[PDB]
């Protein structure tokens, strides 16, 4: 049961609605991508992201002043192909370079890496930010690292304010990478999503089961455990953020000066007493907004007990998984300079403040 | 399967979360209601509404500059009692009177009318606007008229901007009543919501059925019909707004000069070729945002064919029914003066622009 017409047409119809609804956005065709109406903006770093459809408002909802210059939607839960990304970046280059924000998945990484090389060869100054905030990893053989989830939104906003303020390409990439090392996420599901071309949900769950450590692509989580109460659920999530906070991994970034990928080992420290944070209680798609307030209520108690100070918050549907019933919690460690970037103007379909 | 703890505590915990999340709000206790942190604002008409919980963000998400002065939440899908309303109005009176916005339900009307008389007797200048936008009525004996649904949000914003620029109580009331006569709504459901004290959803639907003409209290609609496609669904909704737009009914308003209720026969005219409209595509709770863009896409086509011009739009979760899978469409006739009230600053948890 989905509000769609023909299955071949679902995205054409939804992107048509997006363009008609938002005069500040330009829907480009052949290939299809979205940019701010006034892109390219001369003399500022352009910010680009993209990924599968089915995460609305991520990413097209974040295109506008103080956030993304453009976004490349793909098929449902499928990365965009290098051609969209190439053309989108060429469309938004304002003479100061383009920063690509890439969520850590195999498809996304491959496609965005391919476009990056293609761009550099056409003389576009470009570098990259990889997001890998989801702390839930199944104990098995593999490989893919940590997934990029809701902290992508917070980094997009903070790096967007830096770009808009007029920071250089390198300063913007450096902030994005630093913030990646300081943001932590975990998601749960009480019910699965259904992809239009399915006719049945991603997975099934008994009435007393939750899927713990879930992504954004409808995938089952790292395991099935009992669902007992909101407080218990929030408590296991918050505890996991702490115990899985420490993380060492190899990441690649495009070095445009040398025309090659620079590998780096990077370390995340866990959140500690005394840290100041931005909290995102993110709807995965079909949870009542009221329940998210109940989650926020418990989250503040656990933060207070652990010595964490929530400085700012976002509560709502910011990075979704179609019609999945569940939510995620993201905590991102900030300071005075980062808070000032948060409070800066943003004028997008999904986030607006002045 | 709900994100709650003890059933007795659901609202206590969600309202705690609301208050901790939003420093611009003050949560008052004994009795519980919500106001702007700086209420009462001296020298301006105060706007107040309220209703059952379960419609979040309506109404507490609409408290702030340019919209509600305060709101009285009741129990899940139950009107607040006269004591909350009385105390809330007393808290927000700025010396210029209080305007109560009431959704047309048996419980809401009785409770807000009782508080109106009480306030009048305490020397508070007060009057009322009734909202009865839902054009779907079952053909049977009953007697409650038309329900107040998502047009309440648009009216609260437009009347909120007029109160904020300094219009008198009478001018704000007349604007609210005029707007009520020019707005038309209809909702459908593909899946029912579940109230916490239920453990089963409010109705069941075959996989090819929809509940047509549904409200916001999880009630089944005016009938069950086949569900075939997004387009057919939107078309039946749109067609229904037209054919049921004409409406003659009796409303009561508080005359504060005579200290009595003033009955009035009021007429709604249907939407017509050449009309300019604000369009709201409202999530009833668990519909993916992407699908709402597909609805907007079809809605624009039908509006254009009918000769209607959509001047502004809102798309998202603005007046919900817990975890109901469905949506409503609201069209409100406007002119230059009304659009300028729409474009005016509003600073609330759910609506924010500059």
From Swiss-Prot, chains A, B:
Any one GO BP annotation for this protein: DNA damage response
Active site feature: 55, 217
A GO-annotated cellular component: cytosol
GO MF, one example: phosphoenolpyruvate-glycerone phosphotransferase activity
Keyword Kinase: yes
Listed pathway(s): Polyol metabolism; glycerol degradation
Inducing or repressing factors: Activated by DhaR.
Reactions mediated catalytically: dihydroxyacetone + phosphoenolpyruvate = dihydroxyacetone phosphate + pyruvate
Domain DhaK: 6-351
Entry keyword set: Glycerol metabolism, Kinase, Transferase
EC number annotated for this UniProt entry: 2.7.1.121
UniProt cross-references to Pfam families, sorted A to Z: Dak1
Activity regulation description: Inhibited by chloro-3-hydroxyacetone and D,L-glyceraldehyde.
InterPro entries: DhaK_1, DhaK_dom, Dihydroxyacetone_Kinase
Keyword Kinase: yes
PROSITE patterns for the chain: DHAK
Annotated residues for binding of dihydroxyacetone: 52-55, 103, 108
NCBIfam families cross-referenced by the UniProt entry: dhaK1 (TIGR02363)
Subunit structure: Homodimer. The dihydroxyacetone kinase complex is composed of a homodimer of DhaM, a homodimer of DhaK and the subunit DhaL. DhaL also forms a complex with DhaR.
Extra remark beyond the main annotation: Unlike the carbohydrate-specific transporters of the PTS, the complex DhaKML has no transport activity.
Biological role: Dihydroxyacetone binding subunit of the dihydroxyacetone kinase, which is responsible for the phosphoenolpyruvate (PEP)-dependent phosphorylation of dihydroxyacetone via a phosphoryl group transfer from DhaL-ATP. Binds covalently dihydroxyacetone in hemiaminal linkage. DhaK also acts as corepressor of the transcription activator DhaR by binding to the sensor domain of DhaR. In the presence of dihydroxyacetone, DhaL-ADP displaces DhaK and stimulates DhaR activity. In the absence of dihydroxyacetone, DhaL-ADP is converted by the PTS to DhaL-ATP, which does not bind to DhaR.
Protein name per the record: PEP-dependent dihydroxyacetone kinase, dihydroxyacetone-binding subunit DhaK
Origin organism lineage: Bacteria, Pseudomonadati, Pseudomonadota, Gammaproteobacteria, Enterobacterales
Annotated gene: dhaK
């Amino acid at each position: 049961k989905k509000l769609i017409n023909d299955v071949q047409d679902v995205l054409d119809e939804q992107l048509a609605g997006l363009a008609k609804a938002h005069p500040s956005l330009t829907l480009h065709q052949d290939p299809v991508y979205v940019t701010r109406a006034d892109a390219p903006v001369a003399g500022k770093v352009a910010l680009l992201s993209g990924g599968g459809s089915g995460h609305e408002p991520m990413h097209c909802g974040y295109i506008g002043q103080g956030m993304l210059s453009g976004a490349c939607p793909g098929e449902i839960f499928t990365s965009p192909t290098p051609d969209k990304i190439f053309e989108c970046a060429m469309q938004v280059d304002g003479g100061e370079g383009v920063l690509l924000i890439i969520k850590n998945y195999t498809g996304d990484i491959l496609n965005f890496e391919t476009a990056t090389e293609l761009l550099h060869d056409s003389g576009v100054k470009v570098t990259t930010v990889v997001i890998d905030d989801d702390v839930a990893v199944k104990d098995s053989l593999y490989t893919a690292g940590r997934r990029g989830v809701a902290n992508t939104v917070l980094i997009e906003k903070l790096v967007g304010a830096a770009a808009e303020r007029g920071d250089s390409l390198d300063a913007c990439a450096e902030l994005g990478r630093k913030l990646n090392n300081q943001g932590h996420s975990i998601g749960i599901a009480l019910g699965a999503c259904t992809v239009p071309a399915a006719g049945k949900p991603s997975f099934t769950l008994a009435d007393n089961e939750m899927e713990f450590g879930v992504g954004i692509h409808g995938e089952p989580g790292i395991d099935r455990r009992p669902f007992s109460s909101l407080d218990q659920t929030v408590d296991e999530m918050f505890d996991t953020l702490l115990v899985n906070g420490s993380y060492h991994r190899t990441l690649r970034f495009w070095d445009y000066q040398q025309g090659s990928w620079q590998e780096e080992q990077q370390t995340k420290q866990p959140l500690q007493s005394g840290d100041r944070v931005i909290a995102l209680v993110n709807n995965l798609g079909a949870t009542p907004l009221s329940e998210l307030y109940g989650v926020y209520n418990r989250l503040t108690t656990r933060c207070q007990q652990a010595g964490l100070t929530i400085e700012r918050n976002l509560i709502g549907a910011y990075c979704t998984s179609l019609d999945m019933t569940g939510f995620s919690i993201t905590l991102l460690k900030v300071d005075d300079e980062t808070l000032a970037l948060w409070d800066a103007p943003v004028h997008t379909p999904a986030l607006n403040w002045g």
